[model samples]
Target: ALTTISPHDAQELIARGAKLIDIRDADEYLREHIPEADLAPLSVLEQSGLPAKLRHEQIIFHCQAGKRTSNNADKLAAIAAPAEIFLLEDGIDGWKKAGLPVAVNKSQ
Candidate 1:
């Protein structure tokens, strides 16, 4: 039910003020994630998890495979009000295949 966009098309959205957020499990995200992805687990997505900037004009939810992130896409946008919500076509794996930069921050 959520709109999905490939990593290819994602670039355009990113350039046009879209906030890219990661929705994978915490550990999977700590291992590696796209550059500048603000973590937003689905459980806390509708809460105060996201930063103020994430509620920008649009938000692109990225996950390990793309299933869960888009599973509750509407809720993601609800809290953000006018900000639109989108799903990564194939999640982190899709972006990985494109050779984009990723952050390797580890968890404590």
Candidate 2:
């Protein structure tokens, strides 16, 4: 089962080699995103699935807020099966609220 974890817990997992996946669209991600997250828009993942070469044994998926991720939690979990999966409690917004790093595109 996928569990929702706080931003601080997510941070620790990332430090321990857990993959952080951003399930938001490209435009939103291009605007601002957690620096450590990988762009894996939900739409694409729905069709193509997660890359087979992912190095981490665990993954954390998030959207702009927590709703989108929670809404499609089952599908996400299915796609990432066999590996441990988690949700960022409140997504990138929570990460920033927790004083974690986010990279913004100045020209965007």
Candidate 3:
């Protein structure tokens, strides 16, 4: 099953050791993203050759609006590999709406 969490909940999850994976596209990710999130676009994640090291990680996925991340989480769940997938309930927009800090990609 998939999990849904708010940005505040995600912060707590991180404190408790959940890995953050940003599943948005590179361009969107470059515009803005959560700090320390590993870039693993959903497109690549659906294919083979995902970093083997991350297979066992407790992953929490997030996207711009949460739709893509939730969809990706379900896809990952089908393979039974993404053990703890979570969608940032409000996603980046929500995060920003909540007045949380955000980092911009310098390359943008």
Candidate 4:
């Protein structure tokens, strides 16, 4: 069970100490990502399991759009256990649409 929060809400939560986790692939992440997000690609998550417990009261998991995160909600929820977990409504795309900050790099 996870809640879907708008980009503005995400920013507010982050400001209050929530942890943002990016569940996209490495290449996609290298292209562009939320500056405060942590890369924890779905592939690695499936292969190696959660690396560590989140240090915040809230944990937000997001992808390129939102389908991926929605598709794997159960698994992601498991990884985010013991903490309040959520999905960024529309993911990074929504974040950009809301004029939030992102880190971009020239990816070839």
Candidate number with greatest lDDT = 2
**Model 2 residue 8 distance off true place after TM-score fit, in angstroms:** 1.1
TM-score (all chains, Cα) for each model: 0.71, 0.79, 0.68, 0.76
Clashing pairs in 4: none
The digit string of per-residue lDDT tens for model 4 on 35-77 reads 6777666675566556354446777777666455567787777
Model 2: how large is the Cα RMSD against the reference?
2.7
What TM-score would you give candidate 2 relative to the actual structure? 0.79
Candidates 1 and 3 compared by lDDT, better number: 1
| Per-residue lDDT of model 1, residues 1-108, tens digit only | 257777676777776777777666677446776666777665666566554656776777666654554455666656555556677776465556677556776534
Candidate 4 residue 23 Cα shift, in angstroms, is: 0.4
Candidate whose TM-score is highest: 2
Which residue runs of candidate 4 sit more than 4 Å off their true CA positions? 51-53, 91-94, 106-108
Ranking by TM-score: 2, 4, 1, 3
Q: Using lDDT as the measure, what is the rank order of every candidate, best first?
A: 2, 4, 1, 3
lDDT of 3 by residue, 1-108 (tens): 586766665676665666666666677457666656676665556664342445455666665664544544676655436365666776575445568666775633
For model 1, state the Cα shift of residue 11 in Å: 2.1
lDDT against the true structure, each candidate? 0.65, 0.68, 0.60, 0.67
Which candidate would rank higher by TM-score, 1 or 3? 1
